[PDB]
Amino acid sequence: MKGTIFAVALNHRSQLDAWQEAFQQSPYKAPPKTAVWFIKPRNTVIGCGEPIPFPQGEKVLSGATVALIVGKTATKVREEDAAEYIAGYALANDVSLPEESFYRPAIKAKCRDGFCPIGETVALSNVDNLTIYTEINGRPADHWNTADLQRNAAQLLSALSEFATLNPGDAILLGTPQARVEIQPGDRVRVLAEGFPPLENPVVDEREVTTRKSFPTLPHPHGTLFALGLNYADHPEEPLVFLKAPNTLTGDNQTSVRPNNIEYMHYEAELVVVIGKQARNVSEADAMDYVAGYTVCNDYAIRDYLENYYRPNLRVKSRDGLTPMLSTIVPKEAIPDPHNLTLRTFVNGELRQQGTTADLIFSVPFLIAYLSEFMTLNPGDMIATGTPKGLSDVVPGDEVVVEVEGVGRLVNRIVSEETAK
Ligand SMILES: [Ca+2]
Structure with a gap:
């Protein structure tokens, strides 16, 4: 509808x-x-x-x-x-x-x-x-x-x-x-x-x-949320892409619920690309003209709920409030090279994840060309470009901060089911 x-x-x-x-x-x-x-x-x-x-x-x-x-x-x-x-x-x-x-x-x-x-x-x-x-x-x-x-x-x-x-x-x-x-x-x-x-x-x-069918623009985030699987060389043939339902998104300094009785829930710091203009059959060479700019997400996973059907599946990746995302977009012109930016995660102030977008396997232009080859991208669509190595378990009480150099800093707090209710 x-x-x-x-x-x-x-x-x-x-x-x-x-x-x-x-x-x-x-x-x-x-x-x-x-x-x-x-x-x-x-x-x-x-x-x-x-x-x-x-x-x-x-x-x-x-x-x-x-x-x-x-x-x-x-x-x-x-x-x-x-x-x-x-x-x-x-x-x-x-x-x-x-x-x-x-x-x-x-x-x-x-x-x-x-x-x-x-x-x-x-x-x-x-x-x-x-x-x-x-x-x-x-x-x-x-x-x-x-x-x-x-x-x-x-x-x-x-x-x-x-x-x-x-x-x-x-x-x-x-x-x-x-x-x-x-x-x-x-x-x-x-x-x-x-x-x-x-x-x-x-x-x-x-x-x-x-x-192609166009849509009214609404404040970010609003659009299809694309997300990459393995995309850091940290030292495949084609990109692994999946979609995330919009109710997974939450803002800065909110809470994300850890399910009762699971073994492993981990953060994932990511550079997110936001589309600025309707795109279909765009070459890698002009992909960047269709980018509005950049933001940050924390692409949580509950590893316990992974199965081998349309993996990673919605019960892992589209849970309510398990995708913190900043509401600000840094325009592309403020970031001269998005393939040279540091990503870090801190938990309670301890540095747990660090990498660089220099290690992206599939570049931002490749991704835009790859997707627009078979579907229309529209303004406000988002591409979560993946995460470097350095994952770990987070539990209620934990403060998780993800950061991408030049793009933003994103805070989240883990809580129990009992606390959230
Ligand atoms: Ca991810």
Whole structure:
């Protein structure tokens, strides 16, 4: 819609069945214990009648589904009370490149422009035993049923909101089956279900699609939050990128909660790049013209909650208030070389982490070129560029300060669940 669009992967029993043997082996080792989440960021989100831009060369699959739409702030929603937090339901389309791997986040596959049609919210009581239909050029092409999903809408809302607060207007896509249908330029793709107005979108060669969807600017932070995995040589083939939901963000001198009964929660000091101008298919050579400037984040992780499905997964990386971020942006013109800046972390005044952006594996221009090659970057989007070596455990009472030379100083305080409540 206009809120964050969350989605669940591996929720349809047909896919769990199909992947059973693979999930016993590297790199998965074991089947998912918890829900496997992803996000369809704002560049993806379109309404009925808007085109799905088709990337030349690629195979693209429709992903008819339905989404629950949150009607009031949802934090630790109890399963039995879910309906009272759900405004209704909307037909949606998880448009995607093939789901060939579930190990690393599927950003190229799923976060392309216009890859998330979503329709009208309808006030139904439930979506139990609902057949979701796909038609292509007005011919029946696919159907599946929500009774075959592992977690129902109630259970998904409860499971996600247990650690990630949802705001009114946010959505959760309930899932998709193993078997999907292919779309191609010229196709008209229609999603249908009893009780809903059909959702229809044309698929168009991307070369033909006019200007990209723009958004109103709002005070930083506001935008897609991209984050890098391993990005310091401290002494891979392509970047590991994942997205962070906006409710993870908190300001300066706030608190971040350490879960009860875990072994390891660590800070991560990072240079954050903020986009200043809409960017698509930007070369490394002009990438810097699209940067507004720089800020700092503390990209916390709960190492205990890591799994090998879309890793690092949302239960580790999108927890409420576990991403301190400064509200100030230093303009790029104040920083002559962002690839020559010191990063440090202090805990209670003890220096625990130090490195330099000279050790970035993937440079700021590389990253901008890499992402804009397959999706539109918009003003206010953020790129958390990774963290050097020097991680350690932090516990309630601890004051954690991260600092990037010339960019800013960011304070945070760890607290217990008991203190925060
Ligand atoms: Ca990180």
